[PDB]
Paper text:
We determined the direct target of DW0254 to be [name], a chaperone protein that facilitates cytoplasmic trafficking of farnesylated molecules, including [name], as a target for this compound, thus linking [name] transport with RAC GTPase activation in leukemic cells. The results presented here provide evidence of the importance of [name] in sustaining downstream [name] signaling and cell survival in a large panel of acute leukemia cell lines.
E Docking results in wild type apo structure of [name] and R48delV49del mutant; Root mean square deviation (RMSD) with respect to 3D coordinates of the ligands in the superposed X-ray complex of the wild type protein are reported. In addition, in silico docking of DW0254 to R48del V49del [name] confirmed an accentuated increase in the root mean square deviation (RMSD) in contrast with Deltarasin’s RMSD that was only marginally affected, strongly suggesting DW0254 would be unlikely to bind [name] in the event of deletion of these two residues. Interestingly, the combination of DW0254 and Deltarasin had a significant synergistic effect suggesting that these compounds might be targeting singular conformations of [name] with different efficiencies.
Author numbering: 2 to 150
The structure:
């Protein structure tokens, strides 16, 4: 076999079960998703309350299942607005026990420049690109268009 086939094994056995965003200031739920937004090769949509834009810090929980072991599960997220990369995020989970279900908690501190951009301009015009890696092995690329309601 090969690295390309190993990545497909991990991808085949991977699932995002649920995700939520909390206002880190209060711990109150902003947003809750149950769609597997890790599914690649298509565009997804997420409808998020516009109040998220005025949060200095959001607490994300991603709950995921992996049939395959991963040595160093990490994410690279790029926020695109009108073709322009506004923000770059790097998150690391680390070691994933095979046949495990895990909650990955991340504090996400938005650029202050992003906090004052109007919801009416961002809505429908923002793509989050997520690259799922095992160390340097790219497992999948997923795309979610954001609406701020
Ligand atoms: Ni081989």
């Amino acid at each position: 076999s090969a690295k390309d086939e190993r990545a497909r094994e991990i991808l085949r056995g991977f699932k995002l079960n649920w995700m939520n965003l909390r206002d880190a200031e209060t711990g109150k739920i902003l947003w809750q998703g149950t769609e597997d937004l890790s599914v690649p090769g298509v565009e997804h949509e997420a409808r998020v309350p516009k109040k998220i834009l005025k949060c200095k810090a959001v607490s994300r929980e991603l709950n995921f299942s992996s049939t395959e072991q991963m040595e160093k599960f990490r994410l690279e997220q790029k926020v695109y607005f009108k073709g322009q990369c506004l923000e770059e995020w790097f998150f690391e989970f680390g070691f994933v026990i095979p046949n495990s279900t895990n909650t990955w908690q991340s504090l996400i501190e938005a650029a202050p420049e992003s906090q004052m951009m109007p919801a009416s301009v961002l809505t429908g015009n923002v793509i989050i690109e997520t690259k799922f890696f095992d160390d340097d092995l790219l497992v999948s690329t997923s795309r979610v268009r954001l609406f701020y309601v």
